[PDB]
From a paper:
When the RNA-guided Cas9 endonuclease is in complex with a mature CRISPR RNA (crRNA) and a transactivating crRNA (tracrRNA) or a chimeric single-guide RNA (sgRNA), Cas9 is capable of cleaving any genomic locus in a programmable manner when a protospacer adjacent motif (PAM) is present. The most widely utilized Cas9 nuclease from Streptococcus pyogenes consists of a nuclease (NUC) lobe and an α-helical recognition (REC) lobe. The HNH-like nuclease (HNH) and RuvC-like nuclease (RuvC) domains in the NUC lobe cleave the target DNA strand (complementary to the guide RNA) and the nontarget DNA strand, respectively, while the C-terminal domain (CTD) is involved in the PAM interaction and contributes to the DNA target specificity. The REC lobe is composed of three REC domains (REC1-3) and plays a role in the recognition of guide RNA–target DNA heteroduplexes and cognate sgRNA scaffolds.
Recently, the SpCas9 variant xCas9, which harbors A262T/R324L/S409I/E480K/E543D/M694I/E1219V mutations, was evolved to possess broad PAM compatibility (5ʹ-NG-3ʹ, 5ʹ-GAA-3ʹ, and 5ʹ-GAT-3ʹ) and substantially lower genome-wide off-target activity than WT SpCas9. After screening various DNA substrates, we successfully determined the structures of xCas9 in complex with an 83-nucleotide (nt) sgRNA, a 28-nt target DNA strand, and a 12-nt nontarget strand containing different PAM sequences, TGG, CGG, TGA and TGC, at resolutions of 2.90 Å, 2.70 Å, 3.20 Å, and 3.01 Å, respectively. The structures of xCas9 in complex with non-NGG PAMs (TGC and TGA PAMs) display significant conformational differences in the REC2 and REC3 domains compared with those in WT SpCas9. The REC2 domain in xCas9 rotates approximately 10°, and the REC3 domain moves approximately 5 Å, compared with those in WT SpCas9. In xCas9, E1219 was substituted by V1219 in xCas9, disrupting the salt bridge interactions with R1335 and rendering R1335 more flexible, consistent with a previous study. In the structures of xCas9 in complex with TGC and TGA PAMs, the side chain of R1335 rotated and lost its direct interaction with dC3* or dA3*. In addition, the interaction between R1333 and dG2* was also weakened in the structures of xCas9 in complex with TGC and TGA PAMs. In contrast to the tight bidentate hydrogen bonds (<3.5 Å) between R1333 and dG2* in the structure of WT SpCas9 in complex with the NGG PAM, one of the hydrogen bonds between R1333 and dG2* in the structures of xCas9 in complex with TGC and TGA PAMs was increased to 3.8 Å and 4.3 Å, respectively. Accordingly, in our structures of TGC and TGA PAM-bound xCas9, R1333 remains in the same position as that in the structure of WT SpCas9, whereas R1335 rotates in another direction, resulting in the disruption of the interaction between R1335 and the third nucleotide of the PAM sequence. Notably, the rotation amplitude of the REC domain in xCas9 in complex with TGC and TGA PAMs was significantly different from that in the structures of xCas9/GAT and xCas9/AAG.
Residue numbers in the entry: 1 to 178, 181 to 712, 718 to 765, 776 to 800, 803 to 1012, 1030 to 1051, 1059 to 1241, 1252 to 1365
The structure:
Amino acid sequence: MDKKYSIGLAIGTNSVGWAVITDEYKVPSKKFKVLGNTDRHSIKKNLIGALLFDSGETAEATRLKRTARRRYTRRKNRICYLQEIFSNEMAKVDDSFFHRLEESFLVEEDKKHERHPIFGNIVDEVAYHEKYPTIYHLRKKLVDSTDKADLRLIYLALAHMIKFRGHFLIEGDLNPDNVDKLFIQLVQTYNQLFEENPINASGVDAKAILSARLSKSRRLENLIAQLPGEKKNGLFGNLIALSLGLTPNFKSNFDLAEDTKLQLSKDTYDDDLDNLLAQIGDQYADLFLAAKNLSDAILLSDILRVNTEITKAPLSASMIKLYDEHHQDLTLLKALVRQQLPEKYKEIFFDQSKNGYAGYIDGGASQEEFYKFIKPILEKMDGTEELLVKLNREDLLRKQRTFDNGIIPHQIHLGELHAILRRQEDFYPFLKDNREKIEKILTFRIPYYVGPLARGNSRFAWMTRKSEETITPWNFEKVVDKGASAQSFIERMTNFDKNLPNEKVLPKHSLLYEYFTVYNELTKVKYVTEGMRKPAFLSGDQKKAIVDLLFKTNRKVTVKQLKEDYFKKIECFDSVEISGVEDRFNASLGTYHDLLKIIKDKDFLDNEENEDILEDIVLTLTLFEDREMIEERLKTYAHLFDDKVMKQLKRRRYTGWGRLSRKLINGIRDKQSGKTILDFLKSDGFANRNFIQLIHDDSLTFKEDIQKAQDSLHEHIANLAGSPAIKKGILQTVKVVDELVKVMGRHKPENIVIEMARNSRERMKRIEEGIKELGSQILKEHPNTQLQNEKLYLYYLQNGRDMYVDQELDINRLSDYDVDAIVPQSFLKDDSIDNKVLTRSDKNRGKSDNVPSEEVVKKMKNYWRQLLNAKLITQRKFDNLTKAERGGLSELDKAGFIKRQLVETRQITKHVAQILDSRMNTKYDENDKLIREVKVITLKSKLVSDFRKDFQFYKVREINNYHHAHDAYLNAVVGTALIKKYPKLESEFVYGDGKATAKYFFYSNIMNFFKTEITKRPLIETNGETGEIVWDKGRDFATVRKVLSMPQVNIVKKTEVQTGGFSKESILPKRNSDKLIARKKDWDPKKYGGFDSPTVAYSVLVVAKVEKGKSKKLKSVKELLGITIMERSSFEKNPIDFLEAKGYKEVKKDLIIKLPKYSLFELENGRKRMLASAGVLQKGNELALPSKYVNFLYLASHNEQKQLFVEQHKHYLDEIIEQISEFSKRVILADANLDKVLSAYNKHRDKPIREQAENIIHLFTLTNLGAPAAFKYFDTTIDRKRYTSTKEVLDATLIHQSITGLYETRIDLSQL
RNA sequence: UAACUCAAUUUGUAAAAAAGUUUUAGAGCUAGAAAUAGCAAGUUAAAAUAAGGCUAGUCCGUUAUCAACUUGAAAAAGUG
DNA sequence: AATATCATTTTTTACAAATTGAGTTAT
DNA sequence: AAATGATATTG
């Protein structure tokens, strides 16, 4: 005999609550063993509790770091390739130069070669630096001067350019030739094109308004306003947007039908140049051939300040400028401080700590930090006018290596690197030979669709080798299969067929697919004429022409376009009604319209003899994005088509993948039938059934063939779509249940109920970039951490105006303005900004028992289309916002958002249940049907929430970690109630298998049956049918109150080994310490600094001896030593040696207790401690305030009737404060802190009812389980009191819990 | 539940940049036995960027998974 | 012991798959 | 983005 029982679960990112309830809504107890060496052979625990765990974590930080560490190894190899070239001819100059370079970091003692790296004396080295104060000086010289230079100074320039090579964002060779002499050349090449609209510049120097410090479109609106007669959305406007790095649309201007757009930083441009100038003539080339001169000139102007006349290294020469100015301006500010305020010299030029010039150079102070310190000393000191004008444009004392060198493309470095090579090959012969490689080394880059050049040891690699050999930048295209690999890169991510899980899946843009998508969507359209008694489905036999005419001849088909064109001509049918599709058919033949256009043929592109060649021509377009790859793949089928006919094929690319196979669409047929699902979706006779219909018809073998042709737990919890954060809860939820079921003598429960809970520059990336995209200079009138307050975020989100009625708005008296939800919170529980809108008055949106009325919808409807076009608000926000302009939320929509409030539709929640329902229900019946012994009830997350609000079971988060466990209990109760009082709903609330107020009443009143005061409900609620009673409002409503008063709750925190980085990443300078950790085996951090603050993986209880005196007389010890993440693998290989090498002697190998983090110690008087590492503990103690003082505190913080119970039963405060002190004294042991709490509770009794309540809630963080934390009692912060010794544990009682908490094993550490 | 259309999120992967940091080049100059005064400099660079690891790749090295006992390389099972 | 200071950062390109919420057709 | 262990300074 074991009684009927249920299970409640509350699944969080940080907590799984659980609870075990029985038939009369009670939660048992039980008397489990206690193993180990203690006094106690046993103990009684309640079957309610929680599991706390540290949040799980995304793979990103780890991925970023890994990708970031490949980059590092590759840059080492780049130089290691440059060096190997310079190998043999460098020896003939310098016996060992590259050797000085590798040991440069080494202090002079460990040094092997003469401490001077370049020349290996002083005279020459000292005299290298004078002559070339920056590498850039050596860069320019070597590029310009024609004198045969030193082979080493040549290596140094090359490597610098190769080592820090700049970016790969631009394709095609640009070449710096350069603003107002190149602008004017665009005004004139356009003036004699548009001879009727002759644009005039009239002397104004564009140079100025272009090469200024403002952003892209902001400098465009400075010129279109200047040139009055020219449209900014015109061609010269669109050709000023292509000149400052935007992407225009050139279609309408020349009368074209296609969105022919061009970006001037891709190879798709030179193809997309020949395709625009093959629609409009060849004489329209010197417009984009003027823009491309100006465009690059605009990419230059920004990143260099010198003329291309003087130099051939404008970058390097640009940098020399920044230097010279730095030299000049510094020199100035020197004599200028002497002259004026010499009293403040040492602080600026000598004291690093303070953010002066010393602090800029030798100190940790950046440019920003230095600029904001000196601005106020430049401003007072007269005769410092330009220095500020410099400063206040970001141009004062520039270093040549800056945050913003990120704009240099490798183009610009390839620039100089070539010149140098080009120079010195004349003299050195191995530069002529190897000019190729050296430039390639800079150039070559592993394409993203190959990934790691691995040889079958990389979990991450996927790329296929054409032959086996080492890969190089030079032998790469030969010894790697670029295409195969670029195929595999996709093929390995894209789904297989749900209905043939071995089979692949077709591209979203496959002809074969796109035919199937239309012929699914037409075989169900009905029509109606004048003389037709019932609306008839589409003519099976005569559909094979309704596609021929209307769907082929253009890319989108209109219901009016059909009802007119087919009913006017084809169908001779004057009027026509339509029941299938709304306004325009979802299914278009984008492919057919696109392919006809390209290949100029609907005779062979409508030719369903052989289609199989064209199946790979659209795969190739979807598979690949790098055009060069496309070129290869496509060359075969170019045998038929000419230049134009297999060249504008490289143009049209395709995006995406379909959800269905080639087989399932047009293979898997029937012997009984004699056609395929794509050939039966062309006339199911006079029936014309669907795709989904065709699958689940007993009439054919489809229904089974699919189920016919069809991993562990971890595996299955991995494969779920959701934060890996929650996927932790789900797995532990499943291990919890698995245990509970064993606790109940391996008897499955009756029921299981589940439940589940829920960048200020990133807001100024769509706020600032949305506001500043309508045009208004309002961000110049009223310009990050202010958006987190909700009304200021939303005020700045609506162009400083009302959202319903367009009025302008106020900042100072902005508190009177109310934040009305679009879909009233009565239907949707959206706390999100997407649903929340602010206005002068919420009563000025229209009634709150529907959607925003049609008048405001009319008025501000154009305004609502505007905010979307600027990206401030989305389609779903706008869509609903106008929903009264598309009918209004009906009584069925209402009824919808009142059921969706309580029925869980969220996909993860359903998957959780699918796992639990499968895991429990493992048996079958006589007809092969599943035995549903266990019922999985998925309940939304705001039944119990309000259930507590309603029947006074209020939760206070701050008191202890019990609520997560209570919540699992409550969910069981209500889960078992809403399943007996409405036992129909096991097909709405159970994983198994307008008169709209019917459903709205039902679901909006479903919770009411608990009550006895609606506007008069019975007592014993029951089944309306069966003699099964469910809720005895007398008795049941007081068990629950009872259960929440049980103080003993099983709270358990998962003991976790720590993983990840070894230590704070910061490389600290050389400190004579023992804490510093050597960054490399042979880099004594005495000499070279290193890391400190290792993370510790786990601690171990070492009991052994340690020699004492010069005697070496063994003393005995027993302590916690922490094994560090980095130490870990060494300690694990052989733990005795590891420790022996730490000083430990004759270690007791049997007594090494592995002690991971959160490991739980019971000291004395139930004072408990969890260790965080090896040398600090954290509060292991959970205090149970009685239901009494809990329920009080909600109201005391916060209808009119129970406000009485606040002032009455008041000065509970003293009894509450007490319990806390009788904790803070027993288990907590943080004296002076408690002796502030008190000495500051007494001080503030004159303060109100609530003020004293709120500040008690704060008080708990003292008694809270976990790590100590600071907290404010009114205006007195109280610092954390931490435990900074694990000595007190070493003799105490280590407790090993089980996941629930029920099965313990207590080990008393009185052992030497 | 399944296909479809339109628009946000989320997770996972690949290839790239610029910085930052550390040590070493970059002869400090005078007055003094020193302590310490004056004045001169400053912008650059090599190298490392998880210690490292064997599978030796232009690869891998920071996610996920973890009570205790007995059993297993492990995954995992058994135990109250 | 009480107390104070500390924590690598930013930027770009390419791809796939669920999920969510507003629509059409069904099982 | 905090939050909490490692670090070093205190009389």
